[PDB]
Swiss-Prot record, chains B, D:
Protein species of origin: Rotavirus A (strain RVA/Monkey/United States/RRV/1975/G3P5B[3]) (RV-A)
First and last residues shown, out of full length: 55 to 326 of 326
UniProtKB keywords: Calcium, Capsid protein, Disulfide bond, Glycoprotein, Host endoplasmic reticulum, Host-virus interaction, Metal-binding, Outer capsid protein, Signal, T=13 icosahedral capsid protein, Virion
Main location group: virion
Protein name: Outer capsid glycoprotein VP7
One GO biological process term: receptor-mediated virion attachment to host cell
Binding positions (Ca(2+) 2): Q123, D174, V175, D177, D247
Swiss-Prot record, chains E, F:
Region spans: CNP motif: 115-117
Miscellaneous remark of the record: Some rotavirus strains are neuraminidase-sensitive and require sialic acid to attach to the cell surface. Some rotavirus strains are integrin-dependent. Some rotavirus strains depend on ganglioside for their entry into the host cell. Hsp70 also seems to be involved in the entry of some strains.
Location of the region described as LVD motif in the Swiss-Prot/TrEMBL record: 187-189
Sorted UniProt keywords: Calcium, Capsid protein, Disulfide bond, Glycoprotein, Host endoplasmic reticulum, Host-virus interaction, Metal-binding, Outer capsid protein, Signal, T=13 icosahedral capsid protein, Virion
Segments of this protein annotated with the region GPR motif: 203-205
UniProt-annotated binding residues for Ca(2+) 2: Q127, D178, V179, D181, D251
Name the UniProt record assigns to this protein: Outer capsid glycoprotein VP7
Superkingdom: Viruses
Shown chain mapped onto the complete sequence: 51 to 315 of 326
Length: 36, 272, 141, 272, 265, 265
């Protein structure tokens, strides 16, 4: 299985239950408030 | 060929194809550096050729190919001849390595490549394995669940992976067939290939020069067989080894049989 | 909270079978120089703390430009050896992270992960859920 | 049951009882602490359970039982499961110890106690042996002639006796059958029992993880057998060993067969 | 000689009644009493075993066939009872504070269990039939159990917070736990001191015989509160001494061993 | 399923032609184009491979069936050309200073060689028929040959003095040497940098196809200077760009794969 798969576990006419299995690179950052 | 063959039990036994298969075939020995070191002679190859000449093999039919070590030979072996003999030194610190070498050369493998980054693979049957070659192979695996996450491991934190190899030149790996594994490999230094074990290679013959029979070709623990072309010797020199091989070369090549699959100089077929 | 331009987050409003494998990292605080008018200049320097993976949920990232139905990763903290101390002051050797310069002059804190979910997406792969915003909240403020 | 059984050869081969014996049976591994150490993970048991689950063995049927040393395990081994696997390391200095362990768990024994001080015992057949368990057993024996005197020993001088064990946690002693022996044993730390070897235990499977075949189950120096639930692996890691045992557990259980005699947790029956 | 197989055995009704096996089963079998320390204490003699064996001799049990094995208390004997003989008798004192202990002991020894192991940390167990129980032994067992629902969540308990669990045992040396059949239970146990085993009750053990020395019949062997049986090898006695008890056991050992039958297994 | 044998196969002329195996071989096969660095350089794009795969998709070849493998120079490709695919195309640029090198390349890949090793230092070799040649691969081959007479002495050369030897290769990466068949030769080769193998030619390799992007037909596969053939899978093109060459390969791949047949070996 690919590292970035996308699969369908159920599908009706308009809707569909899609499975997703994916790798991510969370690059976040704090931020500080300074009140003097 | 899909067609059948027919025969009979009344026909006569033909003459010996020996003394002609010799002429129209080539022989190749694989000796360790230790042999030439203990010998300290520069014409031993021509000597052994002149000896083989009595057994029938003509002058330009025998060949010798040095290999510094079992693992340096295990790194992408290339057996390109018609009758190969290998002389293998025994060491309990190298048992699995010189069993994997056996499993690789005695058998005939059909190998596809592997892209670990873009794909996650699995073994279908008890003949599919992963064989990895290079200078230092460190292989770790995380088995996966139905939703493509980890089982006793973290799909990202490579420290949580499960180590099946540590700085090994040739690794033959079998994992639980039916689940998807995420791999981590030293791809810079090692290539890994998904290989299926076909019928055996009857062109080569391993000769364990020292200790008792330990080679377990079959990765399953139940069989532990001993094929006909897996021989053993007890040794204290190397000239006696080579004289014994030359004296009993007919039995060896009667235990061996030319190939049927194809013409190929590597130790494994490639089918992408 | 995390969000991408991928197909997983295009119309995600419903999610089940949620789970993720995240690796742990170490957040280290920096050096904040309290610029006093006159006198000495105390500097709050130090602080290290290890973030370990925890449960996962959903959330909504609200902003003045975009609104995102996003994936919420939690992290718990285990105090590390580098402590933070206000220099030229009677305080030191207390674990934690300071809220003055947590980034330590870094552009970001990087951590890789994998996520696995099951969402409801209209069968037609052309539907779009509103992302952008135009906010006028807190007019009294 | 004493009655006879009858059958035929026209009757049909019923379906595979595998995939139902897995559901209605239990599997139990006996691994060394070395393996837990080299693994250095606190979820590998759940990992292997989830793996086995694909092979059919349900969750609550697979069990793991750590044993620190071959000798510590040899001290009254307690097997109470329907299918027992044992992973046994190889050490030349422990060859006879890990052979006696095999001889004890693979085979089924019927044991009576022994009262050394009050009585003097002998062996009758080639299966009546004296098995001694404990933390440090040092055994000595004096054969006796027809008229209850010593032969190469004195009935009083414990130093004239013939030593056969020196601080061994498990010993299996075979002496000449037909003569009475006076014993001296460290009874404070060890218990010795006169046991008869019955038919084999088909519930257990030994797996020599390391070197060449050395186990001589039978005491007589003529058979040197190799049974079916006695395997051999060549190893450098342990995750490969466990993945192998898992991928090939069906061959193992096909090599094993549930017991016939009775329900028992010990490695030997007691009948006083 | 076919083992592991069960075949139909035939018979008749005109065959004659073969001779008595008593006075030969004694010679070719062994007997083993399990007496409490209280009895030897009251006796205060160092030859009473030899005396009882010399008496047994008259009933046919030779010297090296009878054995005595002492135990300090009912629970100390409940901890892993090893009844390994051809005939076992167990003298048992009555105390209202130990009724359940000496019912569990009876349930354990009188019956022949098939015990498989258990691994609490990983697996969550359930009882399938009315004969599957969890027997825990050791020096101090403290067991708590949480039933679970269809989606692996708790019922009046939290899978994480062990305190929320329901305590069925509190520092018992032997516990036989029967819970509702059909619901996966998560357990917490003092595994440092106790070992717990999933045991299915097979047919009874006809090789043992319990003798309650004091009070009325109390032993509710069957977990189901409907049978409340009283087998043939569940005896009762009134006592003001112990020498009288032992003389009685001796003088009526024949009926005891007629009520006891050697094992099948 | 009999391997290692060759038997007769029978048929007839009444049975009817099957359906087109095209549109299924494309799905269960692999295709591999070998382009030169000049092409990528002139194109100056990083998505041209995905583009060509998307185009092949219109022809039926799926996404991960088509592979592109660069080669900086004809000689760098001649050095151990490893074609491991079920269909191989090789775009080859013409250069009148490289005719023989890129004809040896053709004679090597188009044909199927049974290659055995060679130990120059010990043995003196001869050729047996018009298909046994000596093919040498490496970084810098410098081969010299001394023919010998019946009495193991040289002809116009001295068995010791290497400068008397006759030169047939100097600073070549791939050589294919054909010499007189029936006389023992002695060799001097740069074994450190080139490995030489005694190789017998067999039936062709119908799995690879050469495409001379530029100049006229010059490839003389056949050593014997009487045939000068032009096989079905030795094609030619005229070029002023490379996008047109690739579009042409795409638009006429079906013809190429009808000209190529999967290997027997
Ligand atoms: C086979 O050997 C026999 C005995 O030497 C000989 O007479 C016969 O000619 C041989 N066969 C052929 C085809 O030469
Ligand atoms: C026996 O096996 C056959 C073949 O798989 C199957 O069709 C049949 O239903 C099986 N019968 C039983 C009773 O398992
Ligand atoms: C059985 O008992 C009768 C009466 O005591 C006796 O005569 C007979 O001999 C006994 N049977 C055997 C086999 O001794
Ligand atoms: C063979 O080709 C014909 C013509 O297109 C088609 O009708 C037929 O279905 C094909 N055969 C099979 C087995 O599909
Ligand atoms: Ca290896
Ligand atoms: Ca792990
Ligand atoms: Ca496998
Ligand atoms: Ca021992
Ligand atoms: Ca002596
Ligand atoms: Ca004996
Ligand atoms: Ca109790
Ligand atoms: Ca509660
Ligand atoms: Ca119950
Ligand atoms: Ca050239
Ligand atoms: Ca010359
Ligand atoms: Ca020629």
């Amino acid at each position: 299985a690919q590292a970035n798969e996308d699969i369908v576990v159920s599908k009706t006419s308009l809707w569909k239950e899609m499975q997703y299995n994916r790798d991510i690179t969370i690059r976040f950052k704090f931020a500080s408030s300074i009140v003097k | 060929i899909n067609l059948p063959i027919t025969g009979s039990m009344d026909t006569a036994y033909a003459n010996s194809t020996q003394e002609e298969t010799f002429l129209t075939s080539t022989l190749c020995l694989y000796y360790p550096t230790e042999a030439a070191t203990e010998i300290n002679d520069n014409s031993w190859k021509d000597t052994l050729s002149q000896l083989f000449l009595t057994k029938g093999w003509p002058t330009g039919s025998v060949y010798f190919k040095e290999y510094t070590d079992i693992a340096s030979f295990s790194v992408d072996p290339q057996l390109y001849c018609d009758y190969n003999v290998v002389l293998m030194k025994y060491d309990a610190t190298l048992q699995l390595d010189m069993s994997e070498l056996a499993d690789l050369i005695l058998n005939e493998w059909l190998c596809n490549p592997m892209d670990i980054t873009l794909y996650y693979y699995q073994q279908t049957d008890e003949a599919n394995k992963w064989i990895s070659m290079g200078s230092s192979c460190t292989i770790k695996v995380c088995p996966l669940n139905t939703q493509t996450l980890g089982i006793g491991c973290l799909t990202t934190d490579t420290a949580t992976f499960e180590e099946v190899a540590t700085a090994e030149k040739l690794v033959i790996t079998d994992v639980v067939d039916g689940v998807n594994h995420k791999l981590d490999v030293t791809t810079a230094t090692c290539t890994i290939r998904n290989c299926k074990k076909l019928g055996p290679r009857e062109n080569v013959a391993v000769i364990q020069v020292g200790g008792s029979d330990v080679l377990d070709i079959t990765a399953d623990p139940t069989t532990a067989p001993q094929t006909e072309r897996m021989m053993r010797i007890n040794w204290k020199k190397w000239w006696q080894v080579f004289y014994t091989v030359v004296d009993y070369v007919n039995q060896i090549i009667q235990a061996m049989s030319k190939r049927s699959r194809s013409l190929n100089s590597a130790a494994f077929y490639y089918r992408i | 909270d995390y969000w991408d331009d991928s197909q997983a987050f295009r119309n995600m409003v419903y999610v089940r079978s949620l789970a993720a494998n995240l690796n742990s990292v170490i957040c280290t605080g920096g050096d904040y120089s309290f610029a006093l008018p006159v006198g000495q200049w105390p500097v709050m320097t130090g602080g290290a703390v290890s973030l370990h993976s925890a449960g996962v949920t959903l959330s909504t990232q609200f902003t003045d430009f975009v609104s995102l139905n996003s994936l919420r990763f939690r992290f718990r903290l285990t105090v590390e050896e580098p402590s933070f101390s206000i220099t030229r002051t009677r305080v030191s050797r207390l674990y934690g992270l300071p809220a003055a310069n947590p980034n330590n002059g870094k552009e970001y804190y990087e951590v890789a992960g994998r996520f696995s979910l099951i969402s409801l997406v209209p069968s037609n792969d052309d539907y779009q859920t509103p992302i952008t915003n135009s906010v006028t909240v807190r007019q009294d403020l």
